[PDB]
Subunit: 250 residues, 4 copies
């Protein structure tokens, strides 16, 4: 059927850092007014739903805590359905709390999983232990492949680099471009891919993931990707707009 | 809901080369008898549905031409929904016919796409032209990432290698582990991921793709992957059996 | 000691394709007049010394056949000192003749080496056989890593790509940036690295190789590399000039 | 001429960790008795010459501090000859002191170089700053490519991984397999490659570097590499022995 659910990326679409993109509030309110399930997605694992709601509210956009879905929440949802509840975690804040709520024990003693998110406390010891466990068979999971956040701030992908180099193994990244996180988002809305659209600014992450997941896609040009980037692209967005302000196919 | 549709990989699951895996016939007939939509999937683009039906029949397994779905068919289905109908193709047989049926013009003059499948006629000239077009912006699509077929026979992935090296660009692979081909298979059965299971022998292709697509997965040990390969695996199969002969959760 | 020998790269330094770089003739004649051993180096394996002398003469630059040293000659020199004289060769012309003169038997029956140069006859069969032999333990050698020649013409590196993909092994590239070819060039002049300078236009090949080999280096800006490319460079050229016309430290 | 100088790798050749390889003492004393210049090489940057002499003496092998040459010393020697004397260093101990003796100022303010060695204090902040500087044009140098030391202890290569991922740039590794460190070792002995042999246990580092540098090579089987590893090897050692105990071609 038609568009009945909406997954909308955050950075470069609804927010520029801590400043809302013009029209974001009206765009979101229009969707909620119509009663369409909505998920605001972000590949970063540092913020809780409340943190995000506060960030949005500070910027003048009001939405419920419940609409947010981060790679940390997605990782917890992924692990919930797994056997084994012991993990060595390289991360802090949101991810840690989510894992505890998923019934996990966080330990550096016989862990079943090595989970990497983001932490400014990352150090030689963590890289060492994570590499040791992964090399020894621990299930290697990471929240998102992004190498850095704002500026050149190390992000999950950068923290995994040393661990991968030493162990010779790569983690399963839960976030975009992996199609699984889109599946997780759909399950959160109890929605089907055929009636869901994803709005994003990055052709290589939002669009690629949505496409592979079977979703209709809308690329906005207010972020990373530019219009000429679609010319040579294997697949292309269902629609393209300068920003969410002109989206009216929903 | 429950399992209502089935995607079953071919090589290492139903066939060993030209010899059927014991129990394959009974397994498939049981599924069809129950009236469950069935798709027999293969990442290789060389055979037509009829070729595959004949191969199966020669091996003592009788199934309709219609159940087969190859990376060539999937590629044609992918391109059908695309704008532009001119392509420079590096391939032969099945793929070529499928593209013509999808309304394509195959040309080395201003092609919109560069499509790579498999062809034993692959040569310096083809690599040159493909690289030239891709470097110049043509949409780069490939049927499957496999580097070789039986023995060390070059396969699609190997043919793309030189083109990627020269152009500095990578193609969008339509086949496994890409989740999209699973989506295409579901659409072929008009089925939902939540009620579909995929049976395969390769953890890194059948299982990875099925998992990302939201399908229940069954790993058989009659092919590439072995049981101990799941220990360190980020995700694991819903079920594991020596072969299709013992599968009875369908 | 001082500069007593000279290795000078060809393309982008002395020639632009078939046209001489202004000042090339005078530059070379000045070196020969002083009696300094000279080697004109090129990473490409297609031309014989006579072909190169003819190309230079056609462009108005007169030099002896003996001064030229190609990756094909270097590869033959490399193999001369090796045990085993049976090789499966993916190449044509110059390289083939050089190997025969080095005492080799070219065969697809129990070859000791798999040697890849350049050949416009490259095809599926060659990739297959080369991959089969390398996968089975044959010593994998390639003339140069360049992915393409003029335009997007496949070069040695591109021909190796498919073979590497299938076999899972990489060849030993004889040409630049490998320091060995510089050693081979020095031996050709019976010269020491401490009294030899190399002139080149590519920071990542001529300069990198010369530097690692212990040679003084001169970068000309008449080719691939540009002046701003040295800012972030780990190592830098001993000298930099727009072209050979202003070189006077020799 | 003949062998007049000797470069001998340490780990897996003369030492197993803190235990000497049987015959090491006699091997080394024999070389020094003959008056042949000797350099004991190691790719690791953590120990000073005195530390190494003490380690050897504790193991029962007596040699002068002066014979040792580490990747830290080699890096300092490399930088001594460079313009610019400001560097942001990710490392500790030996490397730091060597840089100060080379006339460097270590700072995180407008550094000319970003130098990575080894430090158990490596953290998010260091990765961030190093990545920021490299991304902004700083000359990226690293002591050695090894990903880990003993066990799964992070080594230089692992520390560079995150920096490379964020900046998109790779460093120039001073240590093996880079031929430059062999050149540096020769200069330390004021020796020519044609009269120098290198003894090592790793085909991919000691042997590869020696070969590219024009040295005669001796592979011992007391460490990383095994005899069957030479079968498919592009190049092969001049000689091969179980350990230094049987080396008598010097
Ligand atoms: Mg975004
Ligand atoms: Mg299979
Ligand atoms: Mg050049
Ligand atoms: Mg060693």
């Amino acid at each position: 059927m038609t568009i009945k659910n909406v997954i909308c990326d955050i950075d470069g679409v609804l927010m520029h850092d801590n400043v809302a993109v013009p029209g974001a509030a009206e765009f979101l309110h229009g969707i909620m007014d119509k009663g369409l399930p909505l998920v605001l997605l972000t590949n970063y694992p540092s913020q809780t739903g409340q943190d995000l709601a506060n960030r949005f509210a500070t910027a003048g956009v009001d939405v419920p805590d419940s609409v947010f879905y981060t790679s940390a929440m997605a990782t917890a949802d992924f692990l919930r359905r797994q056997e084994g509840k012991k993990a060595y975690v390289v991360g802090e804040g949101a991810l840690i709390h989510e894992l505890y709520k998923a019934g996990f024990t966080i330990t550096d003693v016989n862990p079943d999983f090595v989970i990497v998110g983001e932490t400014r406390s990352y150090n030689w010891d963590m890289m060492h232990k994570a590499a040791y466990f992964v090399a020894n068979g621990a299930r290697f999971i990471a929240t998102n492949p992004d190498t850095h956040g704002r500026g050149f701030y190390p992000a999950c992908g950068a923290l995994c680099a040393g661990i991968e180099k030493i162990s010779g193994r790569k983690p399963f990244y839960v976030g975009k471009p992996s199609p699984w996180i889109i599946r997780a988002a759909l399950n959160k809305m109890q929605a089907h891919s055929e009636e869901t659209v994803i709005v994003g600014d990055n052709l290589r992450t939002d669009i690629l993931a949505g496409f592979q997941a079977g979703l209709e896609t809308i690329l906005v040009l207010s972020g990373v990707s530019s219009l000429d980037d679609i010319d040579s692209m294997p697949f292309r967005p269902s629609w393209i707009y300068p920003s969410v302000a002109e989206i009216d196919v929903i």
